[PDB]
Amino acid sequence: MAIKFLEVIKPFCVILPEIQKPERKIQFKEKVLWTAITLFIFLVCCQIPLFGIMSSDSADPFYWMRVILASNRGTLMELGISPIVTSGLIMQLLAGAKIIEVGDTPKDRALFNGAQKLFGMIITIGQSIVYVMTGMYGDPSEMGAGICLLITIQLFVAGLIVLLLDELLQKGYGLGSGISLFIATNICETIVWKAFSPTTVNTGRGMEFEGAIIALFHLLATRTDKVRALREAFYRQNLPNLMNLIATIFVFAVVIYFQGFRVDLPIKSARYRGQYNTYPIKLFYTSNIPIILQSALVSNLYVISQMLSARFSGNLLVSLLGTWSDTSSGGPARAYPVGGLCHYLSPPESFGSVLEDPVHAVVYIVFMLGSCAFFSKTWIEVSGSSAKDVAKQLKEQQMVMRGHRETSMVHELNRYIPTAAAFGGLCIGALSVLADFLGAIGSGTGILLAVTIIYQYFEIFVKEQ
Amino acid sequence: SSHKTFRIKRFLAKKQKQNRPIPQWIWMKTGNKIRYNSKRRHWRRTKLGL
Amino acid sequence: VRYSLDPENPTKSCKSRGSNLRVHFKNTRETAQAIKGMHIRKATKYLKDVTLKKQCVPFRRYNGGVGRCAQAKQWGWTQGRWPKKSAEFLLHMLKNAESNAELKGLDVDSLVIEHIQVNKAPKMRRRTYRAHGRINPYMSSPCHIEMILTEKE
């Protein structure tokens, strides 16, 4: 006899701003315009620095994480999409586990959405306060209470704006999902910036262009040893290499090739004779969502571990969760987990590190593959994308497989969809690990996310068109 | 009856496969007049000879 | 489409129509002559009383064998009936004309059914079986309908 959790949250939901759904079906061109405007606002927020940050050359523990989360350090998007993803993951997991029973009634569904939004906002507030209190922007006493409050408010407002923009796109004002568009754009921006950045960074020997292509052209023009300059550009230790760019391009092509793999199931209209359509079961049936869930969980684990290490030094549980050290080895400060679970979860930076610590690499690979497969299997059940649900959708669409009743369709789909999901998740994890080992610019996870998001957006565009 | 012959089961099979409507893709042709299938047969009224 | 009588003022006049309505043409001509001049609330009320057998429809031109009722002494006639299918066809069509006068912005509470005519549609053909191995026609007599209402204050 549990009082409904949604009923408990219902008074708070009234305070939550909710975007009105469009009374009229929006024109496709108008949807494109809305998507462009929202993307531009998102990019501007990604570039606007937070007010009152004290300039600390403190290590970035989350540099790999920020690209996945569409977060830029020291900007209004420092939190990025992490609170929204975390709240979605938690609420979906609770619904799948049946700890929270969501009724089919619109009131229950509306409460469920409001609760997810409220949790996302609460997580955003908590994370912003946590980041301010952890000294990431400077010592809280030195910054002063007023600056800390201003930064926390700014982070909260930025997160609320992002949540509203995502709601606006999802509700059909724009194309696809705002979270997916933001992730894809951030990854594309980071890769293009690393490729073509005209900024000059002063390495001890000389001023070197950050952008791999610009640096290559400058070195070729300015150096008598053109071959040596090209080799240095290919194998630069401290800046993005042309070889790394080539590796990224190769990974991008490989990912597209795997993305194209599908199993076509022949479906016929019962009403119309001779109408043959294929139901494509993609190899990556569960999409990027297993990656997104795994990365969000790992991100939360890293944040918790860093907080616990900062506040409670030397406790056995804290050491088990993770020990962080800031390695300023001739580079911008990066906080790496040198021990504990966070250490095992962290990707090895190179084949050399994999050779030095083979156990760590094996544990990381096994964890990534297992987590991706588990998340894909759980996601199909939670999402309502199970073979039964697909068969129900086909029945609603009056599409019937030739010679097979709808129940037969369910059995055939049930044969393939679980296998497709688990194998696709394993393949995705393997591709991510391989790209990370190859050092692809923008990360293996980032490249996979961008390619798959772009492919889905293209499919949406073609279908609407 | 149920004691058919082979020539007769085969003739009934042909008379079954001739008993379907015109394909829908067939009256966007150019030199076209066939509005529908008029050579159809109902098992109750017309009794296939034999 | 091309009606028979054009309205004297298209803005304060609404139209409706019906083609190949599987009713009886004689019944529809009589339940149209009963409605021919009423006001649309009077009409919907009358046709509902006709469906509930509280008022009748005097049969004046096609009245062979049509028995005598008591509810016809309001029309000064003796014979009458209660066509239900024909009091429901030109009620779903009075509803269509309503939803076309709201699409024209008229005052539904001020509409008088001004022109209403019923025509005879192409007969549908069936066959009955009679004595001595004779087959006879069993044809259906459908009708076309078309009305025009008008604001008349």
């Binding site: 076509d264 199931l265 022949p266 294929t278 030739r402 | - | -």
Partner: protein
């Protein structure tokens, strides 16, 4: 690859019957794709392979 009858006349009887015994397997796999459901790019290759078999058996006879 467009199988023309010109470059089939120099080949040998068994260098022709191996092409036949490969085209018939490609037929069987296309009449299987037809019933399992396949892409029109494949379905339209039936008319191409039935006529390639026709060209082969014609040059053989």
């Amino acid at each position: 690859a467009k199988i023309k009858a010109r470059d089939l006349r120099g080949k040998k009887k068994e260098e022709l019957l191996k092409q036949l015994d490969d085209l018939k397997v490609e037929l069987s796999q296309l009449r299987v794709a037809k019933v399992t459901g396949g892409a029109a790019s494949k379905l339209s290759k039936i008319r191409v392979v039935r006529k390639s078999i026709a060209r082969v058996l014609t040059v053989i006879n």
